[PDB]
Each structure stands twice: as structure tokens, then as C-alpha cells.
Amino acid sequence: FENRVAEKQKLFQEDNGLPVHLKGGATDNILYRVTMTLCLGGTLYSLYCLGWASFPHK
Amino acid sequence: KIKNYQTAPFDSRFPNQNQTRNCWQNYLDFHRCEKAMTAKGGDVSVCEWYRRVYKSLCPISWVSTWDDRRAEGTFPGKI
Amino acid sequence: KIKNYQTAPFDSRFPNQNQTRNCWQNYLDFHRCEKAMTAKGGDVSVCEWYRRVYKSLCPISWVSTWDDRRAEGTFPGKI
Amino acid sequence: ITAKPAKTPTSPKEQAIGLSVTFLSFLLPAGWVLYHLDNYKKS
Amino acid sequence: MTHQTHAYHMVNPSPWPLTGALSALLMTSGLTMWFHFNSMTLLMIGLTTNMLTMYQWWRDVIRESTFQGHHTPAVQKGLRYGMILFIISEVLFFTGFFWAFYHSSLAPTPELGGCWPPTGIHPLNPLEVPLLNTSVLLASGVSITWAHHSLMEGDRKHMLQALFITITLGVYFTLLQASEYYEAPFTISDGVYGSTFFVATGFHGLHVIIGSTFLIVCFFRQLKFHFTSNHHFGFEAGAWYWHFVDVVWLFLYVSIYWWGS
Amino acid sequence: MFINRWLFSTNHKDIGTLYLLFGAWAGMVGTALSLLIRAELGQPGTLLGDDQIYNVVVTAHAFVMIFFMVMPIMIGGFGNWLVPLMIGAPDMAFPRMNNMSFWLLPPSFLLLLASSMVEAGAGTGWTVYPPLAGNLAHAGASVDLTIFSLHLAGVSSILGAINFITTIINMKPPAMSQYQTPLFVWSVMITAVLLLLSLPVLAAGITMLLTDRNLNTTFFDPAGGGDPILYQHLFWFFGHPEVYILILPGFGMISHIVTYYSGKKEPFGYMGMVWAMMSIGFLGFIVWAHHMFTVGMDVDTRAYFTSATMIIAIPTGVKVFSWLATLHGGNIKWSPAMMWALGFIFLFTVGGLTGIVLANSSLDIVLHDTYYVVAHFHYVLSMGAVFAIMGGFVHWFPLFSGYTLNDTWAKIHFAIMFVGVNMTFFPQHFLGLSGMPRRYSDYPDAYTMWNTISSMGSFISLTAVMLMVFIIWEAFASKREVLTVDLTTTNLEWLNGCPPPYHTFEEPTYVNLK
Amino acid sequence: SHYEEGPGKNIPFSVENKWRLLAMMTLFFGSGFAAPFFIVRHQLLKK
Amino acid sequence: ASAAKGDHGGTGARTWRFLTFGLALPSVALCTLNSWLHSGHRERPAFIPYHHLRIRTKPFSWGDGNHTFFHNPRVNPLPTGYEK
Amino acid sequence: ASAAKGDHGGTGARTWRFLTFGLALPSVALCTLNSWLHSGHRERPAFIPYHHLRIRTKPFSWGDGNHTFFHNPRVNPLPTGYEK
Amino acid sequence: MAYPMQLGFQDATSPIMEELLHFHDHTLMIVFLISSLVLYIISLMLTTKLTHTSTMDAQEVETIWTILPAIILILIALPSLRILYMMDEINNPSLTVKTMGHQWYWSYEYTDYEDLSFDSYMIPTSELKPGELRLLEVDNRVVLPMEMTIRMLVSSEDVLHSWAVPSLGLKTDAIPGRLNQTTLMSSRPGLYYGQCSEICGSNHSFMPIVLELVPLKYFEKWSASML
Numbered sequence A: 001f002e003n004r005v006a007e008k009q010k011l012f013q014e015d016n017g018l019p020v021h022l023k024g025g026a027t028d029n030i031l032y033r034v035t036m037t038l039c040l041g042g043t044l045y046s047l048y049c050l051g052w053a054s055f056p057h058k
Numbered sequence B, C: 001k002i003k004n005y006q007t008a009p010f011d012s013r014f015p016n017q018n019q020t021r022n023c024w025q026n027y028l029d030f031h032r033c034e035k036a037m038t039a040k041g042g043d044v045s046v047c048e049w050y051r052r053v054y055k056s057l058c059p060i061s062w063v064s065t066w067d068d069r070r071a072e073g074t075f076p077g078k079i
Numbered sequence D: 001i002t003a004k005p006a007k008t009p010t011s012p013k014e015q016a017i018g019l020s021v022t023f024l025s026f027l028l029p030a031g032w033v034l035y036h037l038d039n040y041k042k043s
Numbered sequence E: 001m002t003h004q005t006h007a008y009h010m011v012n013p014s015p016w017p018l019t020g021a022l023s024a025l026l027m028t029s030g031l032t033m034w035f036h037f038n039s040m041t042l043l044m045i046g047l048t049t050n051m052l053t054m055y056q057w058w059r060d061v062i063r064e065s066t067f068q069g070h071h072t073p074a075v076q077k078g079l080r081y082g083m084i085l086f087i088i089s090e091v092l093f094f095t096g097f098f099w100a101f102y103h104s105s106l107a108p109t110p111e112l113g114g115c116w117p118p119t120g121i122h123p124l125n126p127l128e129v130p131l132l133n134t135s136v137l138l139a140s141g142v143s144i145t146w147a148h149h150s151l152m153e154g155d156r157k158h159m160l161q162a163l164f165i166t167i168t169l170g171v172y173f174t175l176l177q178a179s180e181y182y183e184a185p186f187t188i189s190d191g192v193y194g195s196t197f198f199v200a201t202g203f204h205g206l207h208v209i210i211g212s213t214f215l216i217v218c219f220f221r222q223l224k225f226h227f228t229s230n231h232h233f234g235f236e237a238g239a240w241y242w243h244f245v246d247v248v249w250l251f252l253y254v255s256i257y258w259w260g261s
Numbered sequence F: 001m002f003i004n005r006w007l008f009s010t011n012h013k014d015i016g017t018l019y020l021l022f023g024a025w026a027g028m029v030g031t032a033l034s035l036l037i038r039a040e041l042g043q044p045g046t047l048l049g050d051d052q053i054y055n056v057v058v059t060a061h062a063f064v065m066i067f068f069m070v071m072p073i074m075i076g077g078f079g080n081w082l083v084p085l086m087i088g089a090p091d092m093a094f095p096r097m098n099n100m101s102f103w104l105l106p107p108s109f110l111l112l113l114a115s116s117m118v119e120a121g122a123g124t125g126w127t128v129y130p131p132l133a134g135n136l137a138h139a140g141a142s143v144d145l146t147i148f149s150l151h152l153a154g155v156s157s158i159l160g161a162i163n164f165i166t167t168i169i170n171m172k173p174p175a176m177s178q179y180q181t182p183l184f185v186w187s188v189m190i191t192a193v194l195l196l197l198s199l200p201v202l203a204a205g206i207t208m209l210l211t212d213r214n215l216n217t218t219f220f221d222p223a224g225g226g227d228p229i230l231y232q233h234l235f236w237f238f239g240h241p242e243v244y245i246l247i248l249p250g251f252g253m254i255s256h257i258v259t260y261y262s263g264k265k266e267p268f269g270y271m272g273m274v275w276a277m278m279s280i281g282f283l284g285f286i287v288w289a290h291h292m293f294t295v296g297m298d299v300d301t302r303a304y305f306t307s308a309t310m311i312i313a314i315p316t317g318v319k320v321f322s323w324l325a326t327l328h329g330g331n332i333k334w335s336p337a338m339m340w341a342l343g344f345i346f347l348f349t350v351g352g353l354t355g356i357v358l359a360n361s362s363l364d365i366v367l368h369d370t371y372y373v374v375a376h377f378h379y380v381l382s383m384g385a386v387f388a389i390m391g392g393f394v395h396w397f398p399l400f401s402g403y404t405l406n407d408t409w410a411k412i413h414f415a416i417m418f419v420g421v422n423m424t425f426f427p428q429h430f431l432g433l434s435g436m437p438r439r440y441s442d443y444p445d446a447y448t449m450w451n452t453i454s455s456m457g458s459f460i461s462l463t464a465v466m467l468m469v470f471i472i473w474e475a476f477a478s479k480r481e482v483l484t485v486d487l488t489t490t491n492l493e494w495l496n497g498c499p500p501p502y503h504t505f506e507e508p509t510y511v512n513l514k
Numbered sequence G: 001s002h003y004e005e006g007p008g009k010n011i012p013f014s015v016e017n018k019w020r021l022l023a024m025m026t027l028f029f030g031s032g033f034a035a036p037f038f039i040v041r042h043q044l045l046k047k
Numbered sequence H, I: 001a002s003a004a005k006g007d008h009g010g011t012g013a014r015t016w017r018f019l020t021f022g023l024a025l026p027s028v029a030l031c032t033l034n035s036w037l038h039s040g041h042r043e044r045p046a047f048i049p050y051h052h053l054r055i056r057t058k059p060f061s062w063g064d065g066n067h068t069f070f071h072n073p074r075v076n077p078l079p080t081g082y083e084k
Numbered sequence J: 001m002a003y004p005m006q007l008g009f010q011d012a013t014s015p016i017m018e019e020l021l022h023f024h025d026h027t028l029m030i031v032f033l034i035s036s037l038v039l040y041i042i043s044l045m046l047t048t049k050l051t052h053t054s055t056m057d058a059q060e061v062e063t064i065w066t067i068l069p070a071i072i073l074i075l076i077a078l079p080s081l082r083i084l085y086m087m088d089e090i091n092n093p094s095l096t097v098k099t100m101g102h103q104w105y106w107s108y109e110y111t112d113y114e115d116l117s118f119d120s121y122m123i124p125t126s127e128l129k130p131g132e133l134r135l136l137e138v139d140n141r142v143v144l145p146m147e148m149t150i151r152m153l154v155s156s157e158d159v160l161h162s163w164a165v166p167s168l169g170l171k172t173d174a175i176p177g178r179l180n181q182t183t184l185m186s187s188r189p190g191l192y193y194g195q196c197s198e199i200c201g202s203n204h205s206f207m208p209i210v211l212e213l214v215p216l217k218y219f220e221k222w223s224a225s226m227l
């Protein structure tokens, strides 16, 4: 392959005020939002299950 | 030859609070003696001792299940 | 019940070229059976098997020395 | 430890109220459940 | 609030800890839904958010070190202690399982036949596949060492080559172990013998997979030149972890496969 | 932005604050649970109706106070806030990971709450011993939910231990040796070592309990050749260390408080003090079986365990005496915090002596599983850990907030709690000697008086905690900001003012290599 | 970053109004203390 | 057994390469040859309904809840005996 | 058992001095206390002329050639039985 | 058994329990000593205006406060261990009785000669005859000959239980698959109560143990009347 590390150093050191988890571009953002969505959605889902199970369902 | 038996006496092989082996061993030993004496045309009256001891120490339920197991041939101990 | 004995048969406990334990064990077992059957008022005819086996396998000299030892009470095996 | 005087002093009356509200938030909900223990026990 | 004059790393606020914490909630309760209300959705969602979190968290660590240069010598030294301490707790984790094993096998209960292995159990032969597994893992302990040295000497081709061999060896062990699991005449439900055998070697097996992907990560980072001949902590940790996995196996082999059967 | 700051934090101070808040909340849950216990036992007969609810409550009480109140407050709260400040560090070694240690706690607590809501809850005792905890006597998700809560809490603290040890060892001023770090820092380092080594054995143990309930393994089921006693060994191998983990940070705080309010530059016998905590930490790993004296172990091993357990009093003795030696000749300020510390020194001594009585396996036969042991651990935990937690809290509260408490109210608070707890637990020594078992929801008529007095003492303490909530309100409501603090020369944490800025030690301290 | 600093500013709750604080504290500790009692009730109400 | 292959079992990437290809890998081939010049097939064990085996205190949360995860019909009997 | 005394079991002469006097030596005192709060006297064993003991295929090249080097009359019988 | 407003141990019914009472008196004497010493010192330290805030030499007194406690501990341990060994002491019993804990009652088995077995349940407070003890009465007591060395073997058929009888100085856990042995010996006839001492579920508080000690002669007839 070829060494393109220096090029990525520049992209990430660029003073754009972005935190490292987003500094990489537009994709970091979609991943981030996908992750947060599943976590919150799933958390809501689990709370619901906890509720159903809390009551005798049989 | 003892039948003036009060109860299983102290056995140095099993000197501590845990007597699980004492019951177990005497139960095995008996059935092994009984088998030998019955398999070589002899007297089981020798095997008596062990039955008294294991009878004194072993919980009823253990003895019942072990017997049932021996009947169905799933007794894990080598008799 | 065997007395139609040819010689000590194959014993899976002692499957290799070294048969030292085979002799030893059978010698022990016999004297232990003999003692039990004599000590609980019974038949030693059960203990026969072991005597035939150990007799077939043990060298004369070993059997002699072990007996002498038992007589003087210096037999190391626990009978 | 030395301090400036209170920036928004809590007069005795204000304290009395604050103490009252606090105690109540601890005693009421539990008293309600406890009072009704029978109503639940009988099933 | 000036320019910092210490060599440490102040990390940007990150959502990954929250996300990872939530993942843990999803997996455990997902496991609870699976075990009792026979459903895998929650567990599946949990597994997914967990990978996403590990991917992004470690991605950032790379960004912060390789790309932003925050791993000064002080920071690295910290990372070393962290890794070691982590391995130590893993050792104690496995110690619980060796305790269980030794406890059961040294004092076999009446219900087992009062002997070890329990009557009815047909243990595997340690001179067959288990000997093989042993030689495969130790061999990868040797190749990973060659990898390390190639790296320190700046030899990119050999580092990649040695790293590759190490990896195929670890993959090979996984396949062999998986085959044995299938071929084995006893199961996890076969009393304390099957219990002890399968959770101890099962967890180790799980660690062999974790170490392999860790090394796979190191492989790709090397393809992209992330490592310099002097700064390559990700690899060192990958290697230490690999030797731990190697050692734990040696104990299983001697204890459970050899002595315990 | 509330988010970036409070949910995505990487600041040791904000995380420490989050822990103090969580721990304060959990303490209310735990206190409520302790009152339901005494409510049931405050009059002969049954109050709750079914004794499984009682058992569920007794269990929850223990987990909440231990895992969700004491540890988060002491280690997560005071640990994160003070550790970096005392050694001149910018933050912890792994500030992002540190945030996960905290966020693993709410989910973990949720699972514990969920366990008592589904099915009939887990009425197993905090020891959660099998077969009672097995899938037969406790079928359903409850115990499994309990096990998972414990996994998360374990992961949280293991990760925390790694952080504290790394930080304390790697991030001090280059010239400062370990023998120049304050005692609290040492106390939290030793605790972290204990957590690192003990928590994983617990995790292994409860994972085995989990597979027994759901994967048909038989580690603890005799049917498959397992042994319920194996569980006990693994659990308590973690369990004794745990009790020392709950008190060590407190030993640290008490040393700082006694030193400060006596007007001394340093505690007496600093190295004897370091030696003592290491010794306690070490010996704390080889005495576990004193919790299993009625289980049927060989007499020789029982003699070993009582002998070993007793040597722990020697190093503990040098600490008690060193605290007293610190007071010697001091210019004493009778502040609330100092009051809490004096109470600790005495109460802890009582509770520890009582533990020496129980160390005797012969005598423990008749004391084991009676209220005499409940009296012991409540002296060392409810009047040890908690008293340290209160002294440390009123002492450093101004550093955390920038505001001061009303000292008179604080003293009123101490006085009430001092009465409440003694009234509550002292009588229980009688119950135990006279034979009252633990974990009972009702008792033979003869034990009525003491149980009655005891339940009454528990309401006094209730008053004290309600009062405390008010005290915090009034401090924040009045807003008396701090001006000057005494003895900053030997108390670094205060040097940056109250409260310290978000980022402290942006420029390191300067320490000569003389 | 540009987070605010000083007394009453390093906390996740506003302390600008003593009475609104009274309410939040009340809810906070209150819900905490109340939880066990409602769980016991919940359990008594299934059977 | 024991061990002693002359010297150089330390220092030099060339040395570790040497050990990798001259000792490690060959050992793997030998154990592979052995593990295949031995590994054929163990006759499936006689089924006897021991109570300390084929444990079932709670059904597995998958399949029919009576089959272990890597169930192998040829060698793993159900609690009632072999399958087919 | 196990072990874990907090940290510092490495680096610094002060540290090793600390371990020497705070852990090593105290262990020796404890084991000394034990080894003396236990060590009294084992009643001399009953003499039985076993043939696998008190071996004599060639006389010792010292004394009367029938006494082992650190012969202790109270506990070491000659082949013929105890001395006095 | 325990009486209202009791402070210490129940009166001793056996010799080891007597031994324990005395050993406890001994230990308590010491805890009073230490605890009073610590309180006196604390009050001494807090009652003077004299100050000495400069540094004090560490080591010097540290030896007194290390050696002294070491001596005191040896004074508690010797006796402790002596008794510990007596309790396990090689006894030669004249009867063996087994008890098996069950979820919510104890069952007894005397099987030396016969196959005598019976369950023992708590008598509900609503079926108590006047003068009977509320949560302590059992319908079928465990009768044993007074003044004899009985061997008790404890186990369980379900969860853990603990068979205890304070007055006699006994507590042995009942563990499934395990037989634990303890040695009983009463020096007086009478009724002696105890209670399950290991959490076993919902009715852990309601499965007492009542021992009835009478002369041999009466034990034998009772055995036979129980089948």
C-alpha cells in the first residue's frame, strides 16, 4: 500500500472545533446518530419489557 | 462378631465433621461383601457389620435412592 | 465358582509387562479375605481364588519371605 | 473556614417552611402506603 | 484555562461511555429476555450497540494518538499500567474456574461414583487434538515474537508475515476447538465434569477470539503504517494479551485435560 | 450544554459530583428499606403479610447500601473529586473510561429494582447462596436480574480500580514519591488493589450460579456432583475483602479530618499508617472462612482461620492509636466534621472488638447467624463507613460547592444520629447472645422488648436524615460563599479555591528534587 | 471548554431560586425514599 | 523429556524467524500428522441412564429445550437415550 | 490463600527496606511463634523390625559402623531396637 | 430457652456450653478493658489547652502498641482453640440420630436398630394450648436419653437449613448431599428449644426444634410407641 498517515494527521489536527468523534467527517455523524438512536430506542424497549414482566402475565 | 451393637463407633478413616464418606463407604462395602459371599457360595453374615453401620449413618432417602439405582443399574459406585 | 482353573487369566488392572502389582495385590487380597472370613466366623473357600492366582504368579521366594514377615509381624502391607 | 455573608439569606420563617416541606416529602408518601397496608394484605 | 504545560491527555467529551453503559443494560436484560421469555431482540440490539461503541471508542483512541499525537511518553506509560492491571483481573477471573474444577475433582461426591472422572464420562485423549492445540498456540507465541522484533527493526514485510502466521494459527486453534466441542461424547449438562470443562475452556475459547480480532486490528493498522519502530502500544498490548491466552491454555491442558482425566 | 458536560463528561470533578448525587439518592432507597425491616420487627406478629416480601426487602437493603451508596460515594465521589487534587494532577489517567464507570451504575441499579418487581423478587439474603437461589427454590428472572446488576457493578468498579491505581502511580509530580502522597490517596490506592483482585472471583462465582440456573450446569447442585459449599468459598473470597474495601477509604478520610481539626501539619506515624493499611489489605485476603464456621470444615482449618483473623487487630490497633496520638497536643476545633470523626473512632472500636469475639470459631458456633453478627457489622458499617462519609462530607462540602453549611444545624444533625444508631443497634447484642436468629420476620415473645426499642431507635435516625436533606437545602439557599480556608500548606486540595475551576493544574505544580 | 465556573455553577441543577430548588430536592430524595414502599405495595397487590 | 538445541533461542528478528520456521511450525506439522494418524472414530458409548448426567433442571432456551448447543447425535444421547 | 497488600512491592531501596521490616521479618516471627507454640515432643515411635528400614549393607565408616551420622537415641532405633 | 429482657446467653444445658459461657466472660472482660481504655484516652486528649502541634517522633511508642495487642490476642486464642478442639473431640456415642431439614420442617430418623422416622412441625399459634410458647412449639419433639452422648447427623433434602439449639451449644448447617456430625450431650432432663439458623425461604422463621430429654428407660418405650 502507501503511507497516507500524514494526510490523516492534518485532517484531524485541523482546528475546526469538532470533538474527535465527529472530526472525521459526515459519516462519524451518521454512525453517532445511529448508535444513539438504537441505544435510546432499545432502552425504551427494555423498560417496556420490565413493565410487562412486572405484572403476572399468565 | 458383633450384634451387641449400640451404634456405629468412631472410625478414624472419617475423623471430621463431614461424614458423607462414612455412610457411602459402608453402603458400598456391604453390597460388595454381599455380592462376593453370594457369588462364591458363602455366608452373608460376614457382611452384616456394614449394613448396621451404613444403616445407622445413612439418611433413609439416600439409602432408598441408591437401592433404586442399583435396581435400574444406574448406581454410579462400582459394586 | 472356579476350581477348573488353568492359570491366572488376563487382568485389566495389570495390563502391561510389569506384573509386580498383580502378584502383590492377589497375595494381599487373599490374606485379607482369609482374615475376614476367619474373624467373622465364615468360610475361607471364598478366599480361594486369590490364593490360586497369587500362587501362580508370585515367585516362591517372594511368597516365602512375605509369609515369614507376617509371622514376625513385620509385613509392610496392611492386611 | 470563613465566608462572606449569605447572598440570599434564609430567614427563620423561610427555614421553617423548608424544613416542613422536606419532612413532608418523606412522611406523606410512606404514610399513605403504610396506612393502607391492610387494604393490600387482605388482597 | 491557559496553554497546558503537562504531558497528559485531556480527552474531548465523549458519548461512548454512555452508549457503552446502555449497551450493557441491553445485553443483560436481553439475556434475561432470552433465558425466560424466549426472545432475542433485546439481546440482539444490545450486541449491536456494543460493537458500534467499541468500534467508535477505539477509533477515536487511534485518532487521538496516531493522528493527533496525544500519546506522549507519560500517556503511554499510563496505558501500560492499565493493560497489565486489566490482565491481572482476567487472571483472577479464570482463577475462580480453576478453583471450581479442583474443588470438584479432588473430592468427587458419592453421586458421581465417588471417583474422578465421574463414572459414565469418556474424556478426550490429551495426546490427540489437545496436544495439537497446545502446539498451535505455543507456536503462535513464537511467531508473534518474531513479529514484534521485525517491527522494532523496521521490517514491514516480515512483521506482516509473522503477524499473519500468528493469526492463522489462532484461527486454526478455534476451528480445532470447535470440532472437538462437536465430537465430544459429553456435554455441558453432564454434571460437574461437563460444567467445569465447558465453561472453563469455553471462556478461554472466547478469549482466543478476542485476542485474534485484536491482532487482526493490529494487522490492518500495520498495513496502513500506523506503527513506528518505537511507538506501537496497540501491538504490545495485543501481544501481552496473546501470551496470557497462551498461558491460560497451558493450565487448562495440564489441569483439566491431562491430570483431570 | 447540559449534555456535553453532564452526560459526556471527561472531568474528574463533574464525574465525582455525579457519583455523590447517585449515592445520595440510593441512600434514600436504602434507608426506606431499612425502615420497612424495623417496621416489621417493631411489634410481635407480622406486618408485611408474606415473609418472602420481608426477605426481598432485607436483601435489597444490603445491596443498595453496599453497592449503591457506600462504594459510589466513597470511591467514586470522594475518590474522583479529591485524588487528582491531592497529587496535583490535571484529571484521571483515563477520563473517558472513568465516565463509563459512573454510567454503568444507573443501569445496574435499574436491574436490581427490576428484580424485586418481577415474580416474587429475590429473597435470598445478600449472600444469594444456592440452592435457595437456584432455579427450583427461586424460579424466574429475579435472581438472574440480581446477578446481572452485580455484573455491571463489578465491571464498573474494576474499571474504576484500574483508573485509580494508574493515576495514583503515574500522575504525581516527578519528584514526589509514593511516600509523600497524603493518606487518603494511599487509602484509595489500596482499596483499588483489593477491588481489582476480589471482584473477578465474585464474577466467576455468580456466573456459575447463572449457568446452574439456566444452562443446566451443576457447579453447586449435588445431583450432578456439585457442591453448594463451593459457592460459599468463592463468594466470601470476595466478601471479606469487600468489607475492608468499604472501610479503607474511611480510614483515609478520618486521618485527614483528625489531622486538620487538631491543627497538625501531618498525621502521627505516617509510615506506620501506610504499613497498617497494606497489612489489613493483605491479611484481608486470607481469612474468608470465618464466615463459614458452622458449615462443617475440618477442625484444623477452623483453627487456622480464627488464628489468622485475629492478627488483623494488630495493624488496626496501630491506626486507632495513631489517630489518638494525632489529637495529642492539638489545638482542637470542635467542628461538625471533627465530631463525626471522634464518633467513628469510638464506634468503630466497639464494632471491631465485637468482631474479635466472633473470630473464635468455638464461640461463633452459637453466635453465627444470630443478631449478634448484625450488631457487629452495623457498628462498623452504619457507624464506621457512614460516620466517615458524613465527616468527609461536611468537611469538604465547601470545597465542592463554594458554599458553607450552617455549622449549628450540622451539630444538631450529628447529635440526633448519634442517639438513633446506638438505640437501634446496641440492644441487638442482647438479642444475639440470647439466641434470636437473623433474617426472621417474627420472633418468640421473649425477644419483644429489645426489638421494640431497636425499631424505635431507627425512627430517630430517620429524623436525622430528613434533617440532613434540609441542611443541604439551606446551604444552597443561603449562599454564603467561602473566603479563606485554614492550613492550605498541608492540604493541597484547597489551594485552587472553592470550588476549584473546571481545569486545575493546567500548569503542573513545581516540586524540587532537593 | 467554555463551561461556566464558580459557586452554584459546577452542578447539574440550578440553584438560582431557593424555592424551585426546594421542589427539585424534594422530588429527588422524595422519589428515592418512596420507591421501596411502593415496591412492597406492588408486591402485596399481585397476591 | 527435557530440551537443549544448542544456543540462540533469543535476540534477533532473524533468530525468531529461524525458530518460527525451524522449530515452531515443524512441531505443528508433527502433531498434525499424529493427530490424524490416530484420530479416527470412538465407537459411540453404551447408553445407561445415569442420573448425574444429561441434567435438565430447566430447558435450554433454544430449539426444543432438550438439546445441548453443539449436540452431536452420534455421540450425545438425550436423557431418554440416543436419538437415531 | 492469595495476596494483595495495596501497592509498592517493587522499586526503591526504601521500599525493600519497608518490605524487609514490615512484611518479611514479621512473618518470620509469626512462624517462629507458631513453630514453638506447637513444637513440643513426639513420643518415640514403637519399634518394629521392618526389613525395609535401618538398612545395613555395609557398615558406616565411623564410630562402630552401626550408628547413622546424626543418630538420636531417643528417636532412632538401631536395627536391633532402641539403644537405652 | 430465652426469657423476657434477657441480656446474655441462655443457661447452659451441656458441658461445652458451660465452657463457652466462661470463655465468653473472659473475652468480654478484655473487650471492656480495651474499650474503656480507648474512651479514657480519647477524653484525656480532648481536655487540655496545652498544645504541641510540632512534630513528634513516630517509632518509639509504636512498639508498645504492637506487642501488647499481640499478647492479649494470644490470651484469647489459647482458650478459644482448646475449646474448639474439645468440641470435635473423639467421642464414643451410644446413639445416632439424623435430622433432615426440609422446606419448612425438620424430620428425624433414629435407625440404629429400628426404622423410626417422623416429621416435626411448628404448632400454629392458633392451635397453642395455654402455656405453650408462640413460635417455638413443635408437635413431635425429638426425644433423647438425657446424660448420654448422642451423635447427630445433619443434612437436608432441599435448600440449606441450620439445626441449632443454643442451650446445648449447637449449630450445624444442614446441606443437601452432605452429612454433618455434631455431638449432643445434655446434663439435665427437660425441654430445650432452637430454631432454623440459615435462610431457607418464606417460612425460615417458623421451623423450630424442640428437644425433650428424659431417662433412657422412657426413651426406649417412646421409641417403640413411635413404631
Ligand code: HEA
Pocket (backbone or CB within 6 Å): F243, F244, F246, F247, F290, F291, F309, F310, F312, F313, F316, F317, F318, F320, F348, F349, F350, F351, F352, F353, F355, F356, F358, F359, F360, F364, F367, F368, F369, F373, F376, F377, F380, F381, F384, F385, J034, J038, J068, J069, J070, J072, J073
Ligand atoms: C466495615 C466492615 C467491617 C469491618 C471493618 C469488619 C471487621 C471485622 N470483622 Fe466483620 N463483618 C462485617 C463487617 C466488617 N467487619 C460484615 C458485613 C459481616 C457479616 C456478613 C454477613 O454474614 O452478612 C461481618 C461478619 C464477621 C464474621 C462472621 C461471623 C458469623 O457470621 O458468624 C466474623 C468472623 O470472624 C467477623 C470478624 C471481624 C473482625 C475480626 C474484624 C476486624 O477487622 C476488626 C479489627 C478492629 C479492632 C480489633 C478494634 C480496634 C483495635 C484496637 C483498639 C487494638 C486492640 C485490640 C485487641 C488487642 C483485641 N466479622
Ligand code: HEA
Pocket (backbone or CB within 6 Å): F020, F023, F024, F027, F028, F031, F034, F035, F037, F038, F058, F059, F061, F062, F065, F066, F069, F070, F073, F124, F125, F126, F127, F374, F378, F381, F382, F385, F386, F389, F390, F393, F421, F424, F437, F438, F439, F440, F441, F458, F461, F462, F465
Ligand atoms: C453500608 C451498609 C449498611 C447500612 C448503612 C445499613 C443501615 C441500616 N441497617 Fe442494615 N444491613 C446491611 C447493610 C447496611 N445496613 C447488611 C449487609 C445486612 C444483611 C442483609 C442480609 O442478611 O442478607 C443488613 C441487614 C439489616 C438488618 C437485619 C435484617 C434481618 O436479619 O432480618 C437490620 C435490622 O434492623 C438492619 C437495619 C439497618 C438500619 C436501621 C439501618 C439504618 O442505619 C438506616 C439509617 C440511615 C443511615 C444510617 C445512612 C444515611 C446515609 C445517607 C443517606 C447518605 C448521605 C449522602 C451524602 C452526604 C452524599 N440491616
Ligand SMILES: [Cu+2]
Pocket (backbone or CB within 6 Å): F239, F240, F243, F287, F288, F290, F291
Ligand atoms: Cu470476613
Ligand SMILES: [Cu+2]
Pocket (backbone or CB within 6 Å): J101, J102, J104, J160, J161, J162, J196, J197, J198, J199, J200, J204, J207
Ligand atoms: Cu429452614
Ligand SMILES: [Cu+2]
Pocket (backbone or CB within 6 Å): J161, J162, J196, J197, J198, J199, J200, J201, J203, J204, J205
Ligand atoms: Cu431457615
Ligand SMILES: [Mg+2]
Pocket (backbone or CB within 6 Å): F294, F368, F369, J162, J197, J198
Ligand atoms: Mg449461616
Ligand code: NA
Pocket (backbone or CB within 6 Å): F040, F041, F042, F043, F044, F045, F046, F047, F441, F442, F443
Ligand atoms: Na414481625
